[PDB]
Write a protein that holds these residues in place. Structure first.
Motif, PDB file in Angstrom:
ATOM      1  N   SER A  48       0.799  -1.217   0.000  1.00  0.00           N
ATOM      2  CA  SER A  48       0.000   0.000   0.000  1.00  0.00           C
ATOM      3  C   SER A  48       0.836   1.273   0.000  1.00  0.00           C
ATOM      4  O   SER A  48       0.272   2.359  -0.171  1.00  0.00           O
TER       5      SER A  48
ATOM      6  N   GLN B 164      -1.279   8.389   5.139  1.00  0.00           N
ATOM      7  CA  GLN B 164      -1.665   7.533   6.255  1.00  0.00           C
ATOM      8  C   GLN B 164      -1.846   8.338   7.535  1.00  0.00           C
ATOM      9  O   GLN B 164      -2.817   8.130   8.272  1.00  0.00           O
TER      10      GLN B 164
ATOM     11  N   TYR C 173      -5.157  10.171   7.412  1.00  0.00           N
ATOM     12  CA  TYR C 173      -6.330   9.422   7.843  1.00  0.00           C
ATOM     13  C   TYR C 173      -6.260   9.060   9.321  1.00  0.00           C
ATOM     14  O   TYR C 173      -7.299   8.839   9.951  1.00  0.00           O
TER      15      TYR C 173
ATOM     16  N   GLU D 115      -7.966  11.703  11.037  1.00  0.00           N
ATOM     17  CA  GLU D 115      -9.412  11.518  11.000  1.00  0.00           C
ATOM     18  C   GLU D 115      -9.870  10.467  12.001  1.00  0.00           C
ATOM     19  O   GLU D 115     -10.922  10.623  12.630  1.00  0.00           O
ATOM     20  N   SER D 116      -9.094   9.391  12.147  1.00  0.00           N
ATOM     21  CA  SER D 116      -9.399   8.376  13.149  1.00  0.00           C
ATOM     22  C   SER D 116      -9.386   8.961  14.553  1.00  0.00           C
ATOM     23  O   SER D 116     -10.133   8.504  15.424  1.00  0.00           O
TER      24      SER D 116
ATOM     25  N   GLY E  45       7.568   0.952   6.393  1.00  0.00           N
ATOM     26  CA  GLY E  45       6.385   0.626   5.618  1.00  0.00           C
ATOM     27  C   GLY E  45       5.194   0.184   6.432  1.00  0.00           C
ATOM     28  O   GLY E  45       4.277  -0.435   5.886  1.00  0.00           O
ATOM     29  N   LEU E  46       5.176   0.484   7.724  1.00  0.00           N
ATOM     30  CA  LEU E  46       4.080   0.102   8.599  1.00  0.00           C
ATOM     31  C   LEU E  46       3.150   1.286   8.828  1.00  0.00           C
ATOM     32  O   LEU E  46       3.539   2.448   8.691  1.00  0.00           O
ATOM     33  N   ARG E  47       1.905   0.974   9.172  1.00  0.00           N
ATOM     34  CA  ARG E  47       0.924   2.022   9.401  1.00  0.00           C
ATOM     35  C   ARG E  47       1.315   2.845  10.627  1.00  0.00           C
ATOM     36  O   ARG E  47       1.824   2.298  11.611  1.00  0.00           O
TER      37      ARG E  47
ATOM     38  N   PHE F  54      -9.114 -10.833   5.186  1.00  0.00           N
ATOM     39  CA  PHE F  54     -10.544 -10.896   5.443  1.00  0.00           C
ATOM     40  C   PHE F  54     -11.328 -10.210   4.330  1.00  0.00           C
ATOM     41  O   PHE F  54     -10.811  -9.352   3.611  1.00  0.00           O
TER      42      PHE F  54
ATOM     43  N   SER G  71       2.988  -3.283   6.252  1.00  0.00           N
ATOM     44  CA  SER G  71       1.769  -3.502   7.018  1.00  0.00           C
ATOM     45  C   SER G  71       0.594  -3.762   6.086  1.00  0.00           C
ATOM     46  O   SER G  71       0.401  -3.052   5.095  1.00  0.00           O
ATOM     47  N   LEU G  72      -0.191  -4.786   6.407  1.00  0.00           N
ATOM     48  CA  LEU G  72      -1.374  -5.124   5.631  1.00  0.00           C
ATOM     49  C   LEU G  72      -2.622  -4.397   6.109  1.00  0.00           C
ATOM     50  O   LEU G  72      -3.663  -4.485   5.450  1.00  0.00           O
ATOM     51  N   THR G  73      -2.542  -3.686   7.231  1.00  0.00           N
ATOM     52  CA  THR G  73      -3.643  -2.874   7.734  1.00  0.00           C
ATOM     53  C   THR G  73      -3.336  -1.416   7.413  1.00  0.00           C
ATOM     54  O   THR G  73      -2.364  -0.851   7.924  1.00  0.00           O
ATOM     55  N   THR G  74      -4.164  -0.812   6.568  1.00  0.00           N
ATOM     56  CA  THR G  74      -3.964   0.552   6.105  1.00  0.00           C
ATOM     57  C   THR G  74      -5.188   1.387   6.449  1.00  0.00           C
ATOM     58  O   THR G  74      -6.324   0.936   6.274  1.00  0.00           O
ATOM     59  N   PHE G  75      -4.953   2.598   6.950  1.00  0.00           N
ATOM     60  CA  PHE G  75      -6.056   3.478   7.310  1.00  0.00           C
ATOM     61  C   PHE G  75      -6.876   3.827   6.076  1.00  0.00           C
ATOM     62  O   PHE G  75      -6.350   4.359   5.095  1.00  0.00           O
ATOM     63  N   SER G  76      -8.167   3.520   6.126  1.00  0.00           N
ATOM     64  CA  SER G  76      -9.067   3.934   5.070  1.00  0.00           C
ATOM     65  C   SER G  76      -9.251   5.449   5.116  1.00  0.00           C
ATOM     66  O   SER G  76      -9.064   6.073   6.163  1.00  0.00           O
ATOM     67  N   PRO G  77      -9.608   6.066   3.987  1.00  0.00           N
ATOM     68  CA  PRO G  77      -9.853   7.517   4.000  1.00  0.00           C
ATOM     69  C   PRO G  77     -10.978   7.929   4.932  1.00  0.00           C
ATOM     70  O   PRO G  77     -11.009   9.087   5.366  1.00  0.00           O
ATOM     71  N   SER G  78     -11.898   7.021   5.257  1.00  0.00           N
ATOM     72  CA  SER G  78     -12.953   7.316   6.217  1.00  0.00           C
ATOM     73  C   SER G  78     -12.442   7.405   7.649  1.00  0.00           C
ATOM     74  O   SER G  78     -13.196   7.832   8.529  1.00  0.00           O
ATOM     75  N   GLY G  79     -11.197   7.017   7.904  1.00  0.00           N
ATOM     76  CA  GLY G  79     -10.638   7.105   9.236  1.00  0.00           C
ATOM     77  C   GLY G  79     -10.823   5.885  10.107  1.00  0.00           C
ATOM     78  O   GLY G  79     -10.697   5.995  11.331  1.00  0.00           O
TER      79      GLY G  79
ATOM     80  N   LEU H 157      -9.864   1.569  10.580  1.00  0.00           N
ATOM     81  CA  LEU H 157      -9.030   0.461  10.136  1.00  0.00           C
ATOM     82  C   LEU H 157      -9.868  -0.543   9.359  1.00  0.00           C
ATOM     83  O   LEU H 157     -10.968  -0.910   9.782  1.00  0.00           O
TER      84      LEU H 157
ATOM     85  N   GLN I 241      -8.874  -3.919   8.359  1.00  0.00           N
ATOM     86  CA  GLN I 241      -8.794  -5.278   8.882  1.00  0.00           C
ATOM     87  C   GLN I 241      -9.427  -5.403  10.261  1.00  0.00           C
ATOM     88  O   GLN I 241      -9.983  -6.454  10.590  1.00  0.00           O
TER      89      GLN I 241
ATOM     90  N   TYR J  26     -13.063  -5.558   9.834  1.00  0.00           N
ATOM     91  CA  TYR J  26     -13.372  -6.777   9.104  1.00  0.00           C
ATOM     92  C   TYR J  26     -13.339  -7.983  10.036  1.00  0.00           C
ATOM     93  O   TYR J  26     -14.199  -8.868   9.955  1.00  0.00           O
TER      94      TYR J  26
ATOM     95  N   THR K 260      -1.910  -6.681  14.342  1.00  0.00           N
ATOM     96  CA  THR K 260      -2.456  -5.645  13.476  1.00  0.00           C
ATOM     97  C   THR K 260      -1.411  -4.619  13.066  1.00  0.00           C
ATOM     98  O   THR K 260      -1.697  -3.779  12.207  1.00  0.00           O
ATOM     99  N   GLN K 261      -0.218  -4.663  13.657  1.00  0.00           N
ATOM    100  CA  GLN K 261       0.850  -3.720  13.356  1.00  0.00           C
ATOM    101  C   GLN K 261       1.973  -4.335  12.536  1.00  0.00           C
ATOM    102  O   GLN K 261       2.381  -3.760  11.521  1.00  0.00           O
TER     103      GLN K 261
END
Lengths: 233, 243, 205, 244, 242, 243, 144, 241, 250
Positions: free
Chosen positions: D7, D20, D23, D26-27, D126-128, F10, I8-16, I18, I20, I23, I122-123
């Motif tokens: 990503s 990132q 967002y 926003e979170s 490359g991590l969130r 998922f 990381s496979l968990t990426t913040f969506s634009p809606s704010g 997570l 995964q 999900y 998740t990280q």
């Protein structure tokens, strides 16, 4: 143009071919002509160097890795350094551990084994360099044709480069001729020079365009350049 | 979704891996190579295609030897099989180093199969595109296994891969039916030459060159070597006699 | 051999004959001056038809036996049935590199349906050899006179056991480090049988 | 090839900001609100826990205020799971500072250590990025009371009054009018309670969903007393503020 | 984006294909090889008159006997220059002699082919090839005065007279007929100033271009502002002769 | 985007698509097997499909003996089955070495299920394509049949079915088990349970078996072995004459 | 395919009608049907069944002698020369698929006409080989 | 761990990450610096969007690297103080290795080198900061002002500004500052820096911070009560003329 | 070679929010409906064992497990994920407390420590979040009985009564009236049995219900006698016979 299946080297086409390797082979084709040939007791390399402009120089398309071996170039210059360095490492290892001069077939096997590990794993790229290994061991004079695909075969003579493969016919017509020539280096070199001349399209052979190497029992590996090559022009 | 064949470890909706299938399809575009399981040992055979006559005859070989009693004959991506047989030789050397017993054929099969499948589990490695007819003689007897790029190996009584794969297997079945009790190595080499000639009929446009080799206890007493001298010529002209 | 660590010593001996090989040992474990266990066992079953005895440091012998058990079980699980030379091979390969730390003498003997019974001995250095009979241990240093002259080839089970008792009697009586009961293992085509002697009978001759 | 599934977390946008952390900011707004007021006599940290029900345990339950040192306490606004690792690292760093210097760690040092931890992930790997922003409160002999704030970007500034979380603008506007430079602890507490009452999404203000942390300095000098207001004392200030 | 070390249907690698044309975005560096030495000149291109002439140094000295110019994006060459200086000094330490210019250039151009992901067999890290082309110049005891061209593609040429950067096509064309084997150092400097003036953006002075020289006895030397000014005056006299 | 179905991630319905597609790969060989639990022993019977006459029947088998006491039958593509067999044998070795006593079937099944779970959770790995049926007799617990899956969901079974017709054999055995109310076959001899399983399998598939169509594995008290072809022929003869 | 959102249910009508005409109640057994697809990986499994199209003849890329035969066939109308080495040209083309050789002939003729020659030579054929091939960019002999 | 390359040569020759970092810097607060005969002045502004930010514990925009050399930045504030930390530790290491206080040129070269390395190393995006380095070398009274770009290019400027609306401040300095005739007094330098700032800040005397650097280990930070003092006569002289 | 999925496979969506995490929450809310409630003298955690095939053995599968002889675990997500989680949590609990402190950690610290693993999942790149939701029940000599619910995001909340699964909404909205300040262990188990009655959809008996209780230290199951310091494990699990006795007590 590039297609979807180009990607990285670790990817199979639906037909069953590697597009990376094919591109490497095309880059091999695009390079200059470096026709070489061998006799029972001699091996001759003939190279046609290329200059960018008038006020320029010529690439050393003939690289020596030992006194009993030699290399030729038909593609990407920088990777030739890596390949020649690996060949020299193995030749020196053979000298220091076995005392046995590296067999030409063994050198080809080592080169193909090296060229594989880029095309087998992610992160590597095929060596877009074409080697014409020559040498002379206790068995006899040998010549190889290395390819980025890892294919290595031994031939009496060949030519890799731009329209170089059009000069293979000259070797084929005279294949029965230069084989029976032993201990006659100058005339074999002359036949090689005739072979490359068939691959010329725009400009003829001159002093600074012809690079010639030759190896043998009485004749160790020697590189001819400058005025030393004008006698064979 | 599309792109189920872009990567390696991805499963198709029907559950069949796709890069392995493309590797299989790449295997068939290779020189034919057969192997006969005679009673005492095995008899390999290859049909290395003669390109433009610049290639030196009787010099380029494709029957690689592992240790003394295991032979490897490969088709398809020749370098990939080169690397596979290299790893196999290393495994046999390690086994003989730390067990001091020559590697048995099924053990070599297990090692090679485990290596082959290790390259079709990840996304960062291309599956092998070489099928091998490796076999030989061990203490318990003789074995002839064909390995496939998917990693599946079987104890064949005879196998062949290449352009003339389909034609070769029919003559293999005919030979097996003609001699149900078994077959001697001496007749097996001639039959292998005949089978290769029948398979080569598909590639009659290009020139052929035949190389054969056999491992046996009756004559070679567990040693692997090629066929040289009058025996190869006798097989060649016997097989050409019926043509 | 460290200072104060438990050592086995004593005597171990295996003799081949027509129907297989009989391997022998004692039950005494002498730790320095003292005797710790007098009913212990020096016989290790690395495989059903392959048997090994232990001599030297007790911990070192037990650890190398466990490693050999692991490797042999791996071999029979994956590749195929084991053999005497493979059992000696794993022992030699285990002992070689760590010879500075690991210092023990091992004798392995097994029966097979093809080559019958064979005996392989591993001295302190770690070499492998095939012999009709072999001895190891400090207590074994005395019977060299007896067994070599009284040894015969292709004997029978009764004669083999008679020879084994008539050879280990001197080992037990002439050295105090070797004693206790005398343990016998019989490896034949029929199977493996366990035989044990008593101190009060082989001494009475 | 292990590329199509990437990503590219640490990538510059065409105009030139990260996406990132964008967002993550926003979170932050979707989490429970927190308030921090800098008073002359002390610092008050209060937060409204989100997702409250009759079955929520309140006897021993602190999810927004955390203790890092006897003098320094922090307020969490965001994903509690990601905040836990940061809290543990901050505690480890403070104890290592006490190991090295045998003196109370100043707030700025810990604030820098946490900001560096966040920035390291926002830069490489490359991590969130961590989707949590902190509110730091503490005391020392260097600058007296200190009230910083953190961000997923890893930048920190000093503030005389901050509120990170939901309805940040409304809380800031409400507090800026009533903020002076001379309140005691009680005035700041009642101001924070009124702000929380006027910014909450529910109707009333029950003691279950409010948490309080206060810093006081009385007869003892050089050591402040850190007390996490338990519900029994929490329901007391409600009648004092008049909300009841 | 897709692939980094990936080839192309034309057979030339990416990145280096882009890097080979990214040099034209930089300044103009010009060198001329004469039997009396080699003359180098660059284009400072102060983005504002508030820049300092002595601030941006596009000419460095790898060694007393070897110096180089710069073109394209400057920042990447700092790694190149550091590695080149380290190689030269280490060769001097190991072999108690100056490093041959061609060997030094070879030891520099090899670094231009290290871009890749997850290098296997050895620890070597690089994202993209360097986008800077260098003009290696110096003197040696075997060949003499040399002028090379450290391309980002890993290949290098010996060059009698070269222009790289913006004037790599304009200035280079004039060098074809303006160069001869009997050229002197003084006339070489005059020709370099003339070609720069032809390729100049603004008026040429000691603050807009910086020149250097390499010699067998004096070695590498950066030309001062006063000598640059008198060279400008001499060029002014030369251009308007008839 | 659409890269969800490619790796173990998922899904909008909360599903792991790759693991779901992995199950469809277990039916490629369409080999039906079942294992019943006797009073003191266990027997597992699997169809033995030899596609070509060139195959040697002896070497082709989907039954692997893990150890001297634990047997295993695996359904799916064979190369992945052999990888699983290698790992299982190595782990049995490691456990026997480290703990000193032969491991029970449940521990091995749980460890392989944990390995498969690690395969699923790690993105760079792909899930195993096989379904493994661990069968053994546990002196600590009793006879036991354990069946894992590519996901890692393992649970002991009174009687296990598999293959394309797993459901049909499942109902066929369930009617007997729900009418006899017993959790295991009451036949004391391992002789009788073999015929019971073969009879139920024949009635379920509706096919008649020969010496080579089916391979039977028997796990008695502290012993596991595979019956030879003559044994299966004798069992079939006994069944034919008895009913 | 199954779909509830939307689909191409119209074309499937023609597909099933073709299936029923090929096999089913009506055969007439005297109407042979040839079909030349290009992507056999997309065809429906029913259409690939026996009873329907039975022989599946594989058309491979031309062999080495095949390329020479193709070049010889497509160079009849044009005024060729008497020194053209067809073997060399055939070897020059590697994995050239059919019409890629007719394009080579056309390009060689076009080049010969452009250069003013009244008849093509081997050089014009080689230039056409370079023109048609993935060297459609050509130029820039930099760094080989 | 992460080995993927993030900076890739674009088809037009630029690096997209570096040229994006240029814009990231372009959104930062304006920072300006000028030098006199023996005085260099680093002027800076602060964000006025939010209030109630104290002064004592607020991190100073101009960070002290050493007693003789100071640094000011613009753009992303998060990443810049990492460069500050690296510069400080490198300066201490240089003191340990060469027994000499660091020079402005060497420190600026090191900062350009680390930014270049981050543009080179894989898995790391380039810094989004642009830095100004000012100070005096040991035993030398000459003020040196250096600008370092995220691309890794460093240059000396007699007067340079970075950040938002830097074009206006640049053109203002291009006509109210003389390179060959620098202001001769600290007061004149401060007045020029202040008058430069009001061209963009347009009120905000509270959040205008100015640091004056002097030789012989003298670095001072003028407080608000002096900045407004200068602003008084500056605005007095503006409208009447 | 190694692992190329370091991102990381968990990426913040634009809606704010997570991806995964939201999900895994959906994957959790469907599945087995488990529950657990806290009483004054103990905590009861209950779940139903959905027998997939009637030829299987629900005895072999352990729907509830023993983290420590004081603390038990109940899940409602994916089986293998819960199994790996419980094994890892037991290992790290041993490492953190039995090795260093010498006893069993309390519920509060153990829950945070186990949630550390999930909040790292998740990280850390190349891995997916655990698809399970954990119900942790435990007791300690200072904080007393406590029940904790662990969400796949890694966030843990103290709850007096809880339920997760398909019937989570009904059970959660039905437990408020059921629960009050004072309760007894048998009262709590009857409450749990009544709540789980409607949420089950298959056969109802002792075999299909997995039930565990944390109560007083019973010395019979301790496994030794002679130490007055310890009085046994507080975590006990009812067998089918034990539970089919209160089943008809409804």
């Amino acid at each position: 143009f590039r297609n979807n299946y180009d990607g990285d080297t670790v990817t199979f086409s639906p037909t069953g071919r590697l597009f990376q390797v094919e591109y490497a082979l095309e880059a091999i084709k695009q390079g200059s002509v470096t026709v070489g040939l061998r006799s029972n007791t001699h091996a001759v390399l003939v190279a046609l160097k290329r200059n960018a402009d008038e006020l320029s120089s010529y690439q050393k398309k003939i690289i020596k890795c030992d006194e009993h071996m030699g290399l030729s170039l038909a593609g990407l210059a920088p990777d030739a350094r890596v390949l020649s360095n690996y060949l020299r490492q193995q030749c020196n290892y053979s000298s220091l551990v076995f005392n046995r001069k590296l067999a030409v077939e063994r050198a080809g096997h080592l080169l193909c084994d090296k060229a594989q590990k880029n095309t087998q794993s992610y992160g590597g790229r095929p060596y877009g360099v074409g080697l014409l290994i020559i040498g002379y061991d206790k068995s006899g004079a040998h010549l190889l044709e290395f390819q980025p695909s890892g294919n290595v075969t031994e031939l009496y003579g060949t030519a890799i480069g731009a329209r170089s493969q059009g000069a293979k016919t000259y070797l084929e017509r005279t294949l029965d001729t230069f084989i029976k020539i032993d201990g006659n280096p100058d005339e074999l070199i002359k036949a090689g020079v005739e072979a490359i001349s068939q691959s010329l399209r725009d400009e003829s052979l001159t002093v600074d365009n012809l690079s010639i190497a030759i190896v043998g029992k009485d004749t160790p590996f020697t590189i001819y350049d400058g005025e030393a090559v004008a006698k064979y022009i | 979704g599309t792109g189920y064949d872009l990567s390696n470890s991805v499963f198709s909706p029907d559950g069949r891996n796709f890069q392995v299938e493309y590797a299989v399809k790449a295997v068939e575009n290779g020189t034919t190579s057969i192997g006969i399981k005679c009673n005492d040992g095995v008899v390999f055979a290859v049909e290395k295609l003669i390109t433009s006559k610049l290639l030196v005859p009787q010099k380029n070989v494709k029957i690689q030897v592992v240790d003394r009693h295991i032979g490897c004959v490969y088709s398809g991506l020749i370098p990939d099989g080169r690397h596979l047989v290299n790893r196999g030789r290393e495994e046999a050397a390690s086994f003989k180093k730390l067990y001091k017993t020559p590697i048995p054929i099924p053990a070599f099969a297990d090692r090679l199969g485990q290596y082959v499948q290790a390259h079709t589990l990840y996304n960062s490695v291309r599956p092998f595109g070489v099928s091998t007819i490796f076999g030989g003689v061990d203490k318990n007897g003789a074995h002839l296994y064909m390995l496939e790029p998917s990693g599946s190996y079987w104890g064949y009584k005879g196998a062949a891969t290449g352009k003339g794969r389909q034609s070769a297997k029919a003559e293999l079945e005919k030979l097996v039916d003609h001699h149900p009790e078994g077959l001697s190595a001496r007749e097996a080499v001639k039959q292998a030459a005949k089978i290769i000639y029948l398979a080569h009929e598909d590639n009659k446009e290009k020139d052929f060159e035949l190389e054969i080799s056999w491992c046996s206890l009756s004559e070679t007493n567990g040693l692997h070597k090629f066929v040289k001298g009058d025996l190869l010529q006798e097989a060649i002209d016997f097989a050409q006699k019926e043509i | 051999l460290k200072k104060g660590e438990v050592s086995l010593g004593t005597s171990i001996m295996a003799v081949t004959f027509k129907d297989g090989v009989i391997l022998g040992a004692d039950s005494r474990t002498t730790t320095g001056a003292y005797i710790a266990n007098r009913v212990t066992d020096k016989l290790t079953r690395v495989h059903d038809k392959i048997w090994c005895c232990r001599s030297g440091s007790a911990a070192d012998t037990q650890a190398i036996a466990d490693i050999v058990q692991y490797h042999l079980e791996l071999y029979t699980s994956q590749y195929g049935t084991p053999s005497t030379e493979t059992a000696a091979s794993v022992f030699k390969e285990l002992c070689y590199e760590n010879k500075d730390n690991l210092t023990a003498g091992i004798i392995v003997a097994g029966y097979d349906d093809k080559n019958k019974g064979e005996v392989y001995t591993i001295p302190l250095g770690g070499s492998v050899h095939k012999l009709p009979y072999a001895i190891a241990g400090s207590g074994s240093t005395f019977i060299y006179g007896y067994c070599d002259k009284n040894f015969r080839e292709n004997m029978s089970k009764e004669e083999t056991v008679d020879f084994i008792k008539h050879s280990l009697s001197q080992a037990i009586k002439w050295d105090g480090s070797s004693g206790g009961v005398i343990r016998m293992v019989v490896l034949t085509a029929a199977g493996v049988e366990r035989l044990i002697f008593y101190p009060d009978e082989y001494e009475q001759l | 090839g292990s590329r199509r599934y990437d990503s590219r977390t640490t990538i510059f946008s065409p105009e030139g900001r990260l996406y990132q952390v964008e967002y993550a900011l926003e979170s932050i707004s979707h989490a429970g609100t927190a308030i921090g007021i800098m008073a002359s006599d002390g610092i008050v940290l209060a937060a409204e826990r989100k997702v409250t029900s009759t079955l929520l345990e309140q006897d021993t339950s602190t999810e927004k205020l955390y203790k890092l040192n006897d003098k320094i306490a922090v307020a969490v606004a965001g994903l509690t799971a990601d905040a836990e690792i940061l809290i543990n690292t901050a505690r480890i760093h403070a104890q290592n500072y006490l190991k090295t210097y045998n003196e109370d760690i100043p707030v700025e040092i810990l604030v820098r250590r946490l900001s560096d931890i966040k920035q390291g992930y926002t830069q490489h790997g490359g991590l969130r990025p961590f989707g949590v922003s902190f509110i730091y409160a503490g005391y020392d002999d260097r600058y007296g009371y200190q009230l910083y704030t953190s961000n997923p970007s890893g930048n920190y500034t000093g503030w005389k009054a901050i509120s990170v979380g939901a309805n940040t603008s409304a809380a800031q506007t409400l507090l800026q009018m009533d903020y002076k430079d001379d309140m005691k602890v009680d005035d700041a507490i009642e101001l924070a309670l009124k702000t929380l009452s006027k910014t909450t999404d529910s109707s009333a203000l029950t003691y279950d969903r409010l948490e309080f942390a206060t810093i006081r300095k009385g007869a003892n000098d050089g050591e402040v007393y850190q007390k996490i207001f338990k519900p029994q004392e929490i329901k007391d200030i409600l009648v004092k503020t008049g909300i009841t | 984006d897709r692939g980094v070390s990936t080839f192309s249907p034309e057979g030339r690698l990416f990145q280096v294909e882009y890097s080979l044309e990214a040099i034209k975005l930089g300044s103009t560096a010009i060198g001329i090889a004469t039997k009396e030495g080699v003359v180098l000149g660059v284009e400072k291109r102060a983005t504002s008159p508030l820049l300092e002439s002595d601030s941006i140094e596009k000419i460095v000295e790898i060694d007393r006997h070897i110096g180089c110019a710069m073109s394209g994006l400057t920042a990447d060459a700092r790694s190149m220059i550091e590695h080149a200086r380290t190689a030269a000094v280490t060769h001097n330490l190991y072999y108690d002699e100056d490093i041959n210019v061609e060997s030094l250039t070879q030891s520099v151009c090899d670094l231009a082919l290290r871009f890749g992901e997850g290098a296997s067999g050895e620890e070597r890290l690089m994202s993209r090839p360097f986008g800077v082309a260098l003009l290696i110049a110096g003197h040696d005891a075997d060949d003499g005065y040399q002028l090379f061209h450290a391309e980002p593609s890993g290949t290098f040429y010996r060059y009698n007279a070269k222009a790289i950067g913006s004037g790599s096509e304009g200035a280079q064309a004039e060098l074809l007929n303006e160069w001869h084997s009997s050229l002197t150092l003084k006339e070489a400097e005059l020709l370099v100033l003339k070609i720069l003036k032809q390729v100049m953006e603004e008026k040429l002075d000691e603050n807009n271009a910086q020149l250097s020289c390499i010699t067998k006895q004096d070695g590498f030397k950066i030309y001062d502002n006063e000598k640059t000014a008198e060279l400008i005056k001499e060029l002014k006299e030369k251009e308007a002769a008839e | 985007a659409g890269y969800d179905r490619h790796i173990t991630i998922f899904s909008p319905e909360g599903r792991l698509y790759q693991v779901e597609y992995a199950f469809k790969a277990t039916n490629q060989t369409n080999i039906n097997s079942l294992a019943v639990r006797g009073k003191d022993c266990t027997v597992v019977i699997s169809q033995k499909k030899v596609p070509d006459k060139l195959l040697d029947p002896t070497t082709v088998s989907y039954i692997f003996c893990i150890s001297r006491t634990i047997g295993m039958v695996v359904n799916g593509p064979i190369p992945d089955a052999r990888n699983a067999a290698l790992r299982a044998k190595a782990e049995a070795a490691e456990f026997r070495y480290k703990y000193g006593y032969d491991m029970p079937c449940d521990v091995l099944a749980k460890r392989m299920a944990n390995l498969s779970q690690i395969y699923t959770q790690r993105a760079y790995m792909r899930p195993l394509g096989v379904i493994l049926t661990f069968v053994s007799v546990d002196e600590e617990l009793g006879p036991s049949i354990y069946k894992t899956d590519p996901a890692g969901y393992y649970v002991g079974y009174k009687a296990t079915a598999t293959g394309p017709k797993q459901q049909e054999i499942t109902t066929n055995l369930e009617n007997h088990f729900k009418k006899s109310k017993i959790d295991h076959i009451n036949e004391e001899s391992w002789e009788k349970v073999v015929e019971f399983a073969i009879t139920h399998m024949i009635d379920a598939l509706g096919t008649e078996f020969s010496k080579n169509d089916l391979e039977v594995g028997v796990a008695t008290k502290d012993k596991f072995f595979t019956l030879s072809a003559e044994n299966i022929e004798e069992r079939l003869v006994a069944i034919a004459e008895q009913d | 395919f199954d779909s509830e959102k939307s689909g191409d249910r119209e074309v499937q009508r023609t597909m099933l009608e073709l299936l029923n005409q090929l096999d089913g109640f009506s055969s007439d057994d005297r109407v042979k049907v040839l079909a030349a697809t290009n992507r056999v990986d997309v065809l429906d499994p029913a259409l690939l069944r026996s009873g329907r199209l039975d022989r599946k003849i594989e058309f491979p890329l031309p062999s080495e002698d095949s390329r020479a035969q193709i070049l010889q066939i497509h160079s009849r109308k044009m005024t060729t020369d008497d020194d053209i080495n067809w073997q060399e040209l055939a070897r020059s083309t590697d994995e050239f698929n059919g019409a890629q050789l007719k394009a080579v002939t056309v390009e060689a003729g076009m080049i010969a006409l452009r250069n003013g020659q009244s008849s093509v030579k081997h050089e014009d054929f080689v230039e056409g080989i370079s023109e048609v091939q993935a060297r459609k960019s050509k130029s820039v002999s930099f760094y080989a | 761990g992460y080995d993927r390359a993030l900076s890739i040569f674009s088809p037009d020759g630029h690096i997209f990450q570096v040229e994006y970092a240029l814009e990231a810097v372009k959104r930062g607060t304006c920072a300006v610096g000028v030098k006199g005969k023996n005085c260099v002045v680093l002027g800076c502004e602060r964000r006025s969007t939010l209030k109630l930010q104290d002064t004592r514990i607020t991190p100073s925009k101009v960070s002290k690297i050493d007693s003789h050399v100071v640094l000011s930045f613009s753009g992303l504030n998060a990443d810049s103080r990492i460069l500050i930390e690296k510069a400080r530790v490198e300066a201490q290491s240089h003191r340990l290795t060469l027994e000499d206080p660091v020079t402005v040129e060497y420190l600026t070269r090191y900062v350009a080198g680390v930014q270049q390395r981050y543009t080179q190393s894989g898995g790391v995006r380039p810094f989004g900061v642009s830095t100004l380095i000012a100070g005096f070398d040991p035993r030398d009274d000459e003020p040196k002002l250096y600008q370092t770009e995220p691309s890794g290019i460093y240059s000396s400027w007699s007067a340079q500004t970075i950040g938002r609306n830097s074009k206006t401040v640049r053109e203002f300095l291009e006509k109210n500052y003389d390179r060959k005739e620098p202001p001769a007094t600290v007061e004149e330098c401060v007045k020029l820096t202040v008058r430069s700032l009001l061209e963009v800040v347009q009120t905000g005397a509270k959040n205008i911070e100015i640091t004056v650097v002097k030789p012989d280990s003298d670095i001072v930070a003028l407080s608000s009560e002096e900045i407004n003092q200068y602003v008084t006569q500056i605005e007095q002289e503006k409208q009447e003329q | 070679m190694t692992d190329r999925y370091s991102f990381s496979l968990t990426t913040f969506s634009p809606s704010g929010k997570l991806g995964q995490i939201d999900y895994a929450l959906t994957a959790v809310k469907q599945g087995v409906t488990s529950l657990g409630i806290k009483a004054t003298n103990g905590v009861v955690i209950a779940t139903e064992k959905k027998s997939s095939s009637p030829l299987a053995m629900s005895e072999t599968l352990s729907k509830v497990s023993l983290l420590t002889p004081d603390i038990g675990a109940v899940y409602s997500g994916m089986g293998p994920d819960y199994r790996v989680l419980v094994d890892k949590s037991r290992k790290v609990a041993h490492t953190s407390y039995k090795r260093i402190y010498g006893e069993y950690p309390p519920t509060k610290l153990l829950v945070s420590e186990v949630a550390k693993i999930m909040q790292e999942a998740t990280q850390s790149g190349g891995v997916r979040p655990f698809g399970v939701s954990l119900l942790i029940a435990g007791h300690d000599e200072f904080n007393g009985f406590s029940l904790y619910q662990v969400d796949p995001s890694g966030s843990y909340f103290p709850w007096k009564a809880t339920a997760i699964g398909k019937g989570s909404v009904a059970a959660k909205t039905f437990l408020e009236k059921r629960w009050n300040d004072e309760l007894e262990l048998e009262d709590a188990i009857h409450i749990a049995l009544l709540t789980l009655k409607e949420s089950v959809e298959g056969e109802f008996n002792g075999d299909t219900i997995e039930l565990a209780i944390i109560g007083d230290e019973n010395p019979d199951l301790l496994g030794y006698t002679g130490i007055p310091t310890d009085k046994g494990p507080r975590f006990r699990k009812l067998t089918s016979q034990e539970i089919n006795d209160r089943l008809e007590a409804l």
